[PDB]
Design a protein around this ligand. Structure first.
Ligand code: FE
Ligand code: FE
Lengths: 288, 288
């Protein structure tokens, strides 16, 4: 261990776990905002959607199917990290609440996606292929592997891993969410899009929380280190969206995608308290 | 480590964390029942209650105040254990869902109680005394200490600790819940009782889940070991309810209390698959 004695969030010292003397109001209120957005997979009517899945072009189906599987697996990764690391490391109560609520929510997202997949792909053969994306889908490896390094990185700091998970939930998902909102614009798959609105909003909040934790950190990574972790993730997201699973497939412009990722990165950088990196405008009218 | 390779729930092997191929339907459905009972402290109108607190005899207030504080602290203990042990140890997904939902719920119970306390005890001086029951209230030490041993008991098995936590949530809370339902019968403190109905129902479910996990265990403690852990807890509960914080205080018969604890213990024993221990009838008409 380092200088954890110096970190308020980490100093192995609440000597607490009695919840009402509320010390951190900014953290609390985030939990409250979480708690208030609760929802269940059950609240999403997937009943029309099979028709739509039907009236879709193949390319549109390959795309979607792959994204669903990419999200299915990623949520899994997110949760594991929270479970075995974040929620263990952080000592401040308010933060424990938020992370415990986030885990419950990841599980619900995991279920929603599973349902989408099961509802669209009647062929259990496929089903499996997709459930096992980490071991099947190369298009999801890098990303999965990048994120997995951080869980196993036992030499690095919380400040570093917090930034990384914020890149995972906010950068690794950005393109995909955006692609889904694209479909909505085009009037397709209501169930897929309606859920997407819920999920994306949860993830946003999960990103804001991470930036807040970052703020409560004393010893954080140097601004160069942060740029590099962000940058690395941006690149990886761009590649997935234009090469591995090109947005062309649902009629999107790969170039504007690439630029939105960057816009997304710069917003995060600002939330973390740094200058922007790329200085690009948001290209999607609808993502505003 | 033992023979974890042999335990389905523990064998460090889901090689999973992809949630939809559902293996354990009994576990799943418990999670679903949990998920469906969600509620927030906010849903409880504590608005009339100050009057009641008023129209109460002192003895009734001492009692209640102490119980609230005892519950406030215990919930804290429950959660810590889940957080740092149960949810880490158990590998089966369905179980991870249930435990992650349980933690979110403990946190909400922790908040409800805090609120009760804050709503009844205007004197922040007191407030504190109660928030710090573990270090102040001797009437809550033994119990707290008994439960804490299990979190730190690093030589004992999951089978043993699961039984113990089931004794904590089901035995250590039984009397108290019962005392609160007694007040309801007598028409007093609606807010305290209404919440109590919610909480008690959650705890019940948390007990049933533990019995289910016990069932999925291969290598469990010998029936004598289980009797002894249960027995130990029964005794301790009886003592708290008749000596430390006597139910006389709210006009209850200490003798019938003692017998209900035992009735409560035997029900748990049966749920765990063993014979009853005490063979007493349930003495409370209203707890039926
Ligand atoms: Fe998430
Ligand atoms: Fe509980």
């Amino acid at each position: 261990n380092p200088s954890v004695e110096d970190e308020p969030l980490l100093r192995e010292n609440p000597r607490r776990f009695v919840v009402f003397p509320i010390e951190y109001h900014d953290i609390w209120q985030m939990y409250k905002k979480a708690e208030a957005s609760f929802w269940t997979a059950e609240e999403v009517d997937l009943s029309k959607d099979i028709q739509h899945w039907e009236a879709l072009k193949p390319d549109e189906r390959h795309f979607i199917s792959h994204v669903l599987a990419f999200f299915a697996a990623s949520d899994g990764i997110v949760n594991e990290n929270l479970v075995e690391r974040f929620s263990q490391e952080v000592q401040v109560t308010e933060a424990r609440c938020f992370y415990g609520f986030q885990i419950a929510m990841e599980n619900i997202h995991s279920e929603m996606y599973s349902l989408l997949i099961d509802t669209y792909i009647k062929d259990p053969k496929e089903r499996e292929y997709l459930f096992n994306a980490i071991e099947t889908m190369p298009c999801v490896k890098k990303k999965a592997d990048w994120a997995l390094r951080w869980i196993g990185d036992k030499e690095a700091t919380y400040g570093e891993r917090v930034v990384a998970f914020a890149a995972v939930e906010g950068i690794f998902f950005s393109g995909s969410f955006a692609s889904i909102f694209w479909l909505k614009k085009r009037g397709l798959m209501p169930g897929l899009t309606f859920s997407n609105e819920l999920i994306s909003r949860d993830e946003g909040l999960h990103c804001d929380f991470a930036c807040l934790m970052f703020k409560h950190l004393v010893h954080k990574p140097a601004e160069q280190r942060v740029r590099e972790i962000i940058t690395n993730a941006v690149r990886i997201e761009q590649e997935f969206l234009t090469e591995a699973l090109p947005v062309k497939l649902i009629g999107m412009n790969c170039t504007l995608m690439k630029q939105y990722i960057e816009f997304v990165a710069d917003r995060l950088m600002l939330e973390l308290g740094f200058n922007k990196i790329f200085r690009v405008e948001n290209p999607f009218d609808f993502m505003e």
